[PDB]
Design a binder for this molecule. Structure first.
Ligand code: ACP
Ligand code: ACP
Ligand code: MG
Ligand code: MG
Lengths: 231, 268, 268, 231, 164
């Protein structure tokens, strides 16, 4: 997908690291000079998602003292990263499909159509098909987006990868002069036998916690938190 | 079948004896021979049951919370008076929406036995609940004491009602007066203020003397009318009740929400 | 610069003498030599100005309606006490949103001269305004009388605060008691009920005797502390004020909204 | 953890002494000379939390009558202790995450951005992970606040410390001048044999209650008020 | 316009009698057996116009105990009369243009597109052009509708018809 400008759908559980994949695709494609605008559809309130993604003009709603422009126009000539697209409501799904195909959208309080050239990299953690037979996600939108799918597996299904991830985390933590830690075989094996809900964020958070706890020392099974210890 | 007289006991100032007047007037009107229902509109804090010594198993909090209907919370109080009990410090009764007050007032129409007396004991202050229960009543009886604060609070309640709801007829009853001239002078002062600023009709009902038999009755958790039926306060309550029974019955519904609009519509 | 002590006078039952205690306690604390501000939390009905004989040109209704700020509504009352006046039957003060109470409490932080006394005379009942003004105060002084209704109302207020806000420390002051043993017995009854149902700390402050000099002061529209400074009630208020001045000053802010959080944050 | 600038989350039960831990962390940090601003999210109504944390201008809503500084600005140069973070509403969670990430916030009803450098110490008694599982808490805010978790233990699990806590609580009453009281060995043993829900809160409440009730006295087995004797 | 199935825009002041003109066009065209469904946009609250015009399915909103179907499907094979179209908000205008051209619409709480064959006779009493330069009415919708305009004059400009 790197050399092709096409809409991407990244499938993976929460915390797998989809934003870095989106940034890697953006900065090494024809958009590398274009803006990268990340938006989390779960952060904006449902009543403000329209104004956030499309923008609004003067007096659009009570509190619209300025003509703030939306995320799509900020991503013109760049890439817009939709994260957890599954909670986005149905009318907004129809307008997103309109942006994807008809390359047009409407501001809030405006009576004109605007054309923007953006690349949409969508991310979600819900089974979109099951939502389709539940009557909650748009089926046509699902086919439009799942042309180039990236399935990012949980860390509990690639446990033998933990050592390399620890090397990368500790390497960055050393580059920023924030300390270093070292594990023995027992600690790494114990970590490999963990369920890891919140995979990579759990791993990074644990690394930071251990750097605070045991700086410049050897980490064993005893020095790991109780929830990580295993026999 | 007949229209039902509804009496709202109010006054804005706390501690003027609104609950004592309500309870004793209820028992006296039952003594004259009417079927009387007394409602404790002090919804957040119940004092009718405290003064009468009652310990209700179900209260109006159970009605609003939906565990029971309105008929099964009635209690047979002294002198045959049927009491509607209120809650005492229940989180679901501290403050209610106007929709809830409207529903509670409207639900009272299920009762069709009382002989045109329903005494409503409003809470202290000029808040939304007090105004809602006063506007829904045919007669408004203001209990006033011979103090500047009580006169000011009564004038404030009258001014609120007249300015924002167009009410013009008020009954005034003096309480804790140490002489009949004290009650007459108190009425004179209240009317002087109202005439100086407003155009409303104040009717003097009577005076309830300061009597320590009332204090003994409160200490005993019984009513002064039944505990000390020969005291000055009891006789004053009997005289007032005789005067109240001579009030004209309601005949025509008004446009706003009020108790027992059904009887005011079908009967004429 | 120092933390400011805030005293909330309450009790739920109306007519127990909350406003009289507030005014006289403020006057006595000013007599001991503190800069005292008295706030009339009776927002719908003003009685502090009535008892003190004041006729304020501008009140808190002007503050909330935005015609003036908070500093210019201060009045220099008796004994050097600065009074914040409330409205009397103004349609914009009958009931206020919790947002408005929060804004009014927060706006008091503009005052930086009082010597750690701010007395808040709350309204009758256990409503939202009373609870908001009690929770914002460091000390909660409950005025209780030797009556079943007053004991029940005070117990209901304590139960509400403890159950829904986790308060455990309360000060209790007896009013209109005809003997010191009456005040002791009243405290015993209140503590008996609270111990039987709750786990809270009640501290006895004192007793204010039933004194007709207070009634003469109310009739004269002046305060019993200044009108009759040698009466039993005045001496009792002086003793209570001496006891109140010995209360521990606040030292740490709490998580909720309270008066003068600025002084509780910066000073430590 | 006290010597570093990191987000601390104090986990335990109700009344376990989290504010004491937070104050000790603040006093032994580089921010000793700064303010300590506590915020209880379970003692402020949901509609008031935003105005209390961020501040407001002269007119922002139907009750704003003056312009005041919020508790983020009050904590500038110090630490902000958010107690009972679990009952914070979800929109306020989103806004708190945005403020923590961007290090900037805006007063309600204003368009001026202000920067504040504060240390966040949050406290919880609810099982957060279960809350993310039910979707009543945000996982991203969770992992921003959970850089260093400190788990406090119930008093029923540290029964041998009760006597020392009693002596410490009596000790602080010497400074806050509400009296003093002493205990008996049988009374101490009886207290040690108690379940203690709301551990330190009930211990302090009982000591306050017995001090005000019987000042400068001695407490026997029958001196205790109720449900504290154990055969 | 009677013998042609095309969208009609009736311009006239309030009370000129646009409903009877719409009924005359409907009952004397190829839709005579089809339903005639009149809807007054100003009558439905602005928050319920979506559900009223397009319908909704189970649990679409708090209070949706039934899957009531909208006005457009009731007008399938007939005519829908939009009265005072000028107060209809902009997103509704975009969806109306979509119904007019693409012949598709979406229900509330539904994730499927429905095709209906309806004839739209729009009526308004406001200067739609002035609303266009005021940024309140859709310009493309205005061109789509004003292909067959009927300007019904006020009675004060045809006073000599009062006798008839
Ligand atoms: N005529 C009278 N003589 C003596 N005491 C009287 C009296 N009228 C009232 N009282 C006393 O007034 C006190 C309060 O009475 P009551 O409870 O009826 O007042 P109230 O209902 O107006 C207070 P609130 O409005 O706050 O509920 C009691 O001690 C009662 O005995
Ligand atoms: N110590 C005392 N001795 C004698 N009478 C007293 C008294 N304290 C109060 N009173 C009487 O009680 C009346 C009411 O006092 P006050 O107005 O302070 O009470 P309160 O604050 O409970 C009224 P509200 O509840 O409406 O605010 C006084 O005007 C006086 O008649
Ligand atoms: Mg009462
Ligand atoms: Mg008062």
């Amino acid at each position: 997908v790197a050399d092709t400008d096409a809409s991407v759908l990244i499938l993976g559980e929460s915390g797998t690291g989809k934003e870095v994949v989106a940034r890697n695709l953006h900065y090494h494609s024809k958009r590398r000079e274009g803006p990268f605008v990340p938006v989390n559809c779960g952060a904006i309130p449902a009543e403000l998602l329209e104004s956030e993604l499309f923008g609004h003009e003067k007096g659009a709603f009570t509190g619209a003292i300025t003509s703030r422009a939306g995320r799509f126009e900020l991503a013109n000539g760049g890439t817009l990263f939709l994260d957890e697209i599954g909670d986005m409501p149905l009318p907004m799904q129809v307008k997103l499909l309109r942006v994807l195909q008809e390359r047009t959208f409407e501001r809030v309080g405006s009576n004109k159509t605007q054309n923007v050239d953006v690349r949409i990299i969508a991310a979600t953690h819900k089974n979109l098909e099951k939502m389709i037979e539940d009557g909650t996600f748009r089926e046509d939108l699902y086919y439009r987006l799942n042309v180039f799918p990236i399935e990012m597996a949980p860390l509990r299904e690639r446990v033998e990868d933990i050592a390399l991830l620890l090397n990368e985390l500790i390497s960055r933590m050393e580059h920023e002069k924030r300390g270093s830690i070292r594990f023995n075989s027992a600690a790494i094996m114990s970590l490999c036998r963990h369920d890891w809900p919140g995979n990579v964020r759990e791993l990074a958070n644990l690394v930071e916690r251990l750097a605070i706890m045991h700086p410049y020392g050897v980490i064993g099974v005893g020095e790991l938190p109780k929830k990580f210890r295993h026999v | 079948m007949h229209p039902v007289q509804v009496i709202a006991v109010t006054g804005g100032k706390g501690g003027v004896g609104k609950t004592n007047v309500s309870v004793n007037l209820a028992l006296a009107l039952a003594d004259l021979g009417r079927r009387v229902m007394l409602l404790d509109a002090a919804l957040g804090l119940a004092n009718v049951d405290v003064l009468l010594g009652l310990t209700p198993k179900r209260t109006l909090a159970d009605v609003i919370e939906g565990r029971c209907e309105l008929r099964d919370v009635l209690l047979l109080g002294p002198g045959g008076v049927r009491i509607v009990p209120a809650a005492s410090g229940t989180q679901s009764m501290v403050h209610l929406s106007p929709m809830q007050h409207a529903g509670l007032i409207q639900a009272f129409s299920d009762i069709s036995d009382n002989l045109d007396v329903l005494v409503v004991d409003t809470a202290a202050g000029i808040g939304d609940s007090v105004v809602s229960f006063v506007r829904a009543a045919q007669e408004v009886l203001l209990v006033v004491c011979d103090e500047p604060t009580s006169i000011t609070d009564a004038y404030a309640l009258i001014k609120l009602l007249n300015r924002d709801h167009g009410m013009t007829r008020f009954r005034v009853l003096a309480n804790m007066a140490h002489s009949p001239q004290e009650g007459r002078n108190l009425f004179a002062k209240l009317t002087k203020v109202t005439d100086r600023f407003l155009d409303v009709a104040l009717q003097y009902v009577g005076v309830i003397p300061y009597d320590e038999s009332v204090r003994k009755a409160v200490q005993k958790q019984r009513a002064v009318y039944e505990a000390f039926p020969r005291s000055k306060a009891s006789l004053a309550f009997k005289a007032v009740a005789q005067k109240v029974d001579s009030w004209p019955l309601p005949a025509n519904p008004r446009g706003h929400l009020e108790f027992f609009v059904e009887r005011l519509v079908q009967h004429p």
